A paper describes a structure:
The tripartite motif (TRIM) proteins form one of the largest subfamilies of RING-type E3 ubiquitin ligases, comprising more than 80 members. TRIM family members typically contain a RING domain usually catalyzing ubiquitin transfer; one or two B-box domains mediating protein–protein interactions; and a large coiled-coil domain region, which is involved in self-association or oligomerization with other TRIM E3-ligase proteins. About two-thirds of human TRIM proteins feature a PRYSPRY domain, also known as the B30.2 domain, in their C-terminal region. All characterized family members shared the same overall PRYSPRY twisted β-sandwich fold consisting of a 7-stranded and a 6-stranded antiparallel β-sheet.
A characteristic feature of the putative substrate-binding site in the closely related homologs MID1 and MID2 is an arginine located at the C-terminus of β-strand 7 (R587 in MID1 and R637 in MID2) that projects its guanidinium group toward the center of the cavity and two neighboring tryptophan residues lining the pocket. The orientation of the side chain of the two tryptophan residues in MID2, Trp602 and Trp694, showed an intriguing variation in the crystal structures. The MID2 domain was solved in two different crystal forms. In the C2221 crystal form, which contains one protein molecule per asymmetric unit, the side chains of Trp602 and Trp694 engage in π-stacking interactions.
Numbering used by the authors: 531 to 559, 569 to 710
Write the structure that this text describes.
Amino acid sequence: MNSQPFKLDPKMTHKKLKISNDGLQMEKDPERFSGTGCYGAAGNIFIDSGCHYWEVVMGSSTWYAIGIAYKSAPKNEWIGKNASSWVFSRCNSNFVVRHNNKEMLVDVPPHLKRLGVLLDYDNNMLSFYDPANSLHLHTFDVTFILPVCPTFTIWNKSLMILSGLPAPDFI
């Protein structure tokens, strides 16, 4: 594994997010707001080689999108709705992977609170895992044409980033 620690990039973080001092936690500062306004942030590293693994703790969030993007994705447009963004997304009961405004359903075990992100840049893959259940969720087969940056987007609650990780045994 090539995995290195990274944190959120303050220049790429939505101004309405509360960020921890280590740059690893982001939080939005029975009727709910359905407004599609997302709160996105990008990591402070770009990758164009090697094999990288990180995890995200989603806790109680019910609406989030986690993945990678080229620099060409516009700021705060990291939810798979352009050709520069690849995400795993939850919205309440719906789990998808999304890229270029095209989705595929993902069947996810109940009560997902942690996501694993495996970027095998050299072998043209981005894979999502359920680490609690030690299992594969989805692989994009993609030959990246620019460097990629981790991205993290919420509509509610908070995320925590676990970076610099040894590939768990289920890789």
